[PDB]
């Protein structure tokens, strides 16, 4: 009699059952289809492939990402993910499970409804709900107020929240996040001499990045110290016993989030885009925000990012102000945890949207229940 929590990432689907401390399954938000007919012959009647199964079978397929920058765009492929999730990952029957979904901030009225529809009419769930990807992250930390920095693989959002609601007027977006960073990491490594071309080396620069990257406190210091003495080097071993060595590339890659000018973005540095937001707010509350800055998303995992956010949001804000950056160790599966939590609540049951409620009011119901 338990519920389902599915967290859509434009890079990873993170799903599990409500009440548990971590998604049971996590996989690639992709959809691979044969590049031509000759690939369908032996298919054995199946249409597409999904997640990891769509990885290893790359050459024969054409991969597509149903989520772009956080917003779902290739629907019929989002329907194929959701399916695979329910049946193949969780091994459960949608039809008999309440389901908490996540919408990115500024989720379009239509996208919210379209999604609703599909869940009840295509998957016939017993009841389901939709939560803003950000708010959950905050909830997951036990806060009903704060300004969350959701940074995943596709998008970077700055979110202010008072007494539950987000303030869509103060939402700050940044089309710079993971993919981008991984990718720069390459540019800067290639410039270094290495050669990351194949799709395989790409997944190598991500692993590399993932494990030897951080965020310098005083950049030009670590920068100057990085090229004067080899003290800050590290080395990485590829699959065939071959070793590479990452120099200042270590902090030059994540430096982008604070300096979009690197990859060529007239957009403001996250530190700023964060200040810029706490400022778009009612004077008497920011106070609480400035102090409750909470981070989530795979790309805010870079070590020393909190110790760097301090450094910055601090220097931009008032001399008397009190700032406190909340960076949870499992800040990656933050979003998902929230939904879990949310769904396992008593005061929450009365809030779901039930199959029977959806039938007299239609899907335009999303706007009256999910606040």
């Amino acid at each position: 009699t338990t519920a389902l929590v599915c967290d859509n990432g434009s890079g990873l689907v993170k799903a599990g059952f409500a009440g548990d401390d971590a998604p049971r399954a996590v996989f690639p938000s992709i959809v691979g289809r044969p590049r031509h007919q000759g690939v369908m012959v032996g298919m054995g009647q199946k249409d597409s492939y999904v997640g990891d199964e769509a990885q290893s079978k790359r050459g024969i397929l054409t991969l597509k990402y149903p989520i772009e920058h956080g917003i779902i765009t290739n629907w019929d492929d989002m329907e194929k993910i959701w399916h695979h999730t329910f049946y193949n990952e969780l091994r459960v029957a949608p039809e008999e499970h309440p389901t908490l979904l996540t919408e990115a901030p500024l989720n379009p009225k239509a996208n919210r409804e379209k999604m609703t529809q599909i869940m009840f009419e295509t998957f016939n769930v017993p009841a389901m709900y939709v939560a803003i990807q950000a708010v959950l992250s905050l909830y997951a930390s036990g806060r009903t107020t704060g300004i969350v920095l959701d940074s995943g693989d596709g998008v970077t959002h700055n979110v202010p929240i008072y007494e539950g609601y987000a303030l869509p007027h103060a939402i700050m977006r940044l089309d710079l996040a993971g993919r981008d960073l991984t990718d720069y990491l390459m540019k800067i490594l290639t410039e270094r001499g290495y050669s990351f071309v194949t799709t395989a080396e790409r997944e190598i620069v991500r692993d590399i990045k993932e494990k030897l990257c951080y965020v310098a406190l005083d950049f030009e210091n670590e920068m100057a110290t990085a090229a004067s003495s080899s003290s800050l080097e590290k080395s990485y071993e590829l699959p065939d016993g071959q070793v590479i060595t990452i120099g200042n590339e270590r902090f030059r890659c994540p430096e982008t989030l604070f300096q979009p000018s690197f990859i060529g973005m007239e957009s403001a540095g996250i530190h700023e885009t964060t200040y810029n937001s706490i400022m778009k707010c009612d004077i008497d509350i920011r106070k609480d925000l400035y102090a409750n800055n909470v981070m989530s998303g795979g790309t805010t995992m870079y070590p020393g990012i909190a110790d760097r956010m301090q450094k910055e949001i601090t220097a931009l804000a008032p001399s008397t102000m009190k700032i406190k950056i909340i960076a949870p160790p499992e800040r990656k599966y933050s979003v998902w945890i929230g939904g879990s939590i949310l769904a396992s609540l008593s005061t929450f049951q009365q809030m779901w949207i039930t199959k029977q409620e959806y039938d007299e009011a239609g899907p335009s119901i999303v706007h009256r229940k999910c606040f």
Binding site: D20, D21, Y139, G142, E163, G164, L345, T347, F348, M351
Partner: peptide
């Protein structure tokens, strides 16, 4: 009665481990 929903999110819950 949503206020008690935060009264809770604040107080907390106890998620079952796994693996």
């Amino acid at each position: 009665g949503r206020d008690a929903l935060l009264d809770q999110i604040r107080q907390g819950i106890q998620l079952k481990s796994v693996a």
